[PDB]
Design an enzyme around this catalytic site. Sequence first.
Site, PDB file in Angstrom:
ATOM      1  CG  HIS A  79      -2.026  -1.057   1.106  1.00  0.00           C
ATOM      2  ND1 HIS A  79      -1.918  -2.281   1.733  1.00  0.00           N
ATOM      3  CD2 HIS A  79      -3.194  -1.086   0.422  1.00  0.00           C
ATOM      4  CE1 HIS A  79      -2.973  -3.018   1.438  1.00  0.00           C
ATOM      5  NE2 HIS A  79      -3.763  -2.317   0.642  1.00  0.00           N
ATOM      6  CG  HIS A  83      -2.000  -0.112  -4.168  1.00  0.00           C
ATOM      7  ND1 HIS A  83      -2.679  -1.035  -4.937  1.00  0.00           N
ATOM      8  CD2 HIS A  83      -2.916   0.427  -3.331  1.00  0.00           C
ATOM      9  CE1 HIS A  83      -3.951  -1.046  -4.583  1.00  0.00           C
ATOM     10  NE2 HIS A  83      -4.121  -0.168  -3.613  1.00  0.00           N
ATOM     11  CG  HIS A 119      -7.507   4.405  -2.853  1.00  0.00           C
ATOM     12  ND1 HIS A 119      -6.728   4.517  -3.984  1.00  0.00           N
ATOM     13  CD2 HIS A 119      -7.309   3.153  -2.380  1.00  0.00           C
ATOM     14  CE1 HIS A 119      -6.078   3.385  -4.182  1.00  0.00           C
ATOM     15  NE2 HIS A 119      -6.413   2.541  -3.223  1.00  0.00           N
ATOM     16  CG  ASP A 120      -4.765   2.495  -0.158  1.00  0.00           C
ATOM     17  OD1 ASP A 120      -5.594   2.355   0.765  1.00  0.00           O
ATOM     18  OD2 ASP A 120      -4.627   1.643  -1.062  1.00  0.00           O
ATOM     19  CG  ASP A 230      -8.101  -0.675  -3.810  1.00  0.00           C
ATOM     20  OD1 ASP A 230      -6.915  -0.290  -3.881  1.00  0.00           O
ATOM     21  OD2 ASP A 230      -8.656  -0.907  -2.719  1.00  0.00           O
ATOM     22  CD  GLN A 268      -2.716 -13.987  -4.080  1.00  0.00           C
ATOM     23  OE1 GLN A 268      -3.199 -13.675  -2.995  1.00  0.00           O
ATOM     24  NE2 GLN A 268      -2.517 -13.104  -5.060  1.00  0.00           N
TER      25      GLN A 268
HETATM   26  C1  LIG Z   1      -5.987  -5.068   1.245  1.00  0.00           C
HETATM   27  C2  LIG Z   1      -5.634  -6.412   0.604  1.00  0.00           C
HETATM   28  C3  LIG Z   1      -6.514  -6.682  -0.618  1.00  0.00           C
HETATM   29  C4  LIG Z   1      -5.717  -7.370  -1.729  1.00  0.00           C
HETATM   30  N1  LIG Z   1      -5.367  -6.840  -2.899  1.00  0.00           N
HETATM   31  N2  LIG Z   1      -4.749  -7.666  -3.573  1.00  0.00           N
HETATM   32  C5  LIG Z   1      -4.252  -7.403  -4.943  1.00  0.00           C
HETATM   33  C6  LIG Z   1      -4.608  -8.828  -2.942  1.00  0.00           C
HETATM   34  C7  LIG Z   1      -4.013 -10.043  -3.255  1.00  0.00           C
HETATM   35  O1  LIG Z   1      -3.458 -10.221  -4.338  1.00  0.00           O
HETATM   36  N3  LIG Z   1      -4.075 -11.075  -2.311  1.00  0.00           N
HETATM   37  C8  LIG Z   1      -4.729 -10.862  -1.092  1.00  0.00           C
HETATM   38  C9  LIG Z   1      -4.815 -11.900  -0.169  1.00  0.00           C
HETATM   39  C10 LIG Z   1      -5.919 -12.289   0.476  1.00  0.00           C
HETATM   40  C11 LIG Z   1      -5.769 -13.346   1.271  1.00  0.00           C
HETATM   41  S1  LIG Z   1      -7.048 -14.125   2.175  1.00  0.00           S
HETATM   42  N4  LIG Z   1      -6.861 -15.739   2.069  1.00  0.00           N
HETATM   43  O2  LIG Z   1      -6.972 -13.693   3.608  1.00  0.00           O
HETATM   44  O3  LIG Z   1      -8.375 -13.732   1.596  1.00  0.00           O
HETATM   45  S2  LIG Z   1      -4.148 -13.894   1.227  1.00  0.00           S
HETATM   46  C12 LIG Z   1      -3.693 -12.673   0.114  1.00  0.00           C
HETATM   47  O4  LIG Z   1      -2.452 -12.491  -0.413  1.00  0.00           O
HETATM   48  C13 LIG Z   1      -1.654 -13.667  -0.206  1.00  0.00           C
HETATM   49  C14 LIG Z   1      -0.194 -13.335  -0.521  1.00  0.00           C
HETATM   50  N5  LIG Z   1      -5.290  -9.674  -0.823  1.00  0.00           N
HETATM   51  C15 LIG Z   1      -5.238  -8.674  -1.714  1.00  0.00           C
HETATM   52 MG   LIG Z   2      -6.385   0.493   1.514  1.00  0.00          MG
HETATM   53 ZN   LIG Z   3      -5.778   0.611  -2.415  1.00  0.00          ZN
END
Ligand SMILES: CCCc1nn(C)c2c(=O)[nH]c(-c3cc(S(N)(=O)=O)sc3OCC)nc12
Ligand SMILES: [Mg+2]
Ligand SMILES: [Zn+2]
Length: 311
Positions: A79, A83, A119-120, A230, A268
């Site tokens: 963040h 980003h 936003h961030d 986002d 993921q």
């Molecule tokens: C504020 C985080 C939202 C987010 N943005 N992006 C691009 C990602 C992402 O690529 N991966 C994840 C994410 C989510 C989890 S879980 N299982 O808790 O829903 S694990 C993870 O990234 C793993 C490296 N989260 C995010």
């Molecule tokens: Mg944020």
């Molecule tokens: Zn963001």
Amino acid sequence: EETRELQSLAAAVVPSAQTLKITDFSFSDFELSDLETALCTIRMFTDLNLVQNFQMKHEVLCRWILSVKKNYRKNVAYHNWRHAFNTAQCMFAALKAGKIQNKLTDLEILALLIAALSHDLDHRGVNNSYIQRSEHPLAQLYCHSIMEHHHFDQCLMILNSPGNQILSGLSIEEYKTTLKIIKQAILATDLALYIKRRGEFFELIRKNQFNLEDPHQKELFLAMLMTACDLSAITKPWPIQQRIAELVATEFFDQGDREKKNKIPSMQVGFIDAICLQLYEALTHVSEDCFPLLDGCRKNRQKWQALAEQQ
Ligand SMILES: CCCc1nn(C)c2c(=O)[nH]c(-c3cc(S(N)(=O)=O)sc3OCC)nc12
Ligand SMILES: [Mg+2]
Ligand SMILES: [Zn+2]
């Protein structure tokens, strides 16, 4: 602030959107220097006709962009400015290549771009103790989007800083409308609000009752669009998504805010299924030209799933 950095940014010629590649949904910024992301940002405002329609002064826009970039923390693995920059680029591409531009008003477009970039602001990483160390350690239970409100506060502070007022050209009425949309858009980046309002959006699309002419539906759509941009790192070409996932993992687990590695693939996939797929499918329903985001998301799910099964 570097008067040196500003002088150099303000005097440079801004290359075309084509040359900067910002109209591509597959865009990546790894090869770009900060100055170059600043130039891309100027081009985004220009080609969306924002500079013209709102009489933005060149030096002021340059100063505003540098101030925004300066207020993100580089020590935060994901963040950070890049980003925010990427979120704004996705907004630009969705508006241009995705043809969403024709569905919105100039003010809404102005608000969305500013919101994507801001936003961030001042984000301290997902593992921060900001509220935890305040006089209101329970605030998040009252106002869950409290950090998003703080991001907006930073945004407004910059828009009001001397020499950075890019909205000085708007009438008080245009201005109030724009700030309201900017606020809603930034608050919309609270993933909890996305999850809370998803259903209604998916329902309308589903029952073919989605109508942007409906003031409530337009507002809902703006929030969904903000979320789509986002999270767009999840839609990038495999090699780029792998790198972006590395940054997220770092911020999430190595507190790169201010083992898991083997669980990342399945994580993921779960994220894509639970949060992303539905959103990008819905967006394509509104505008089929946004399909590449959905397509890219699917391809990454396939890639992470293969790894999850362990190769
Ligand atoms: C504020 C985080 C939202 C987010 N943005 N992006 C691009 C990602 C992402 O690529 N991966 C994840 C994410 C989510 C989890 S879980 N299982 O808790 O829903 S694990 C993870 O990234 C793993 C490296 N989260 C995010
Ligand atoms: Mg944020
Ligand atoms: Zn963001």
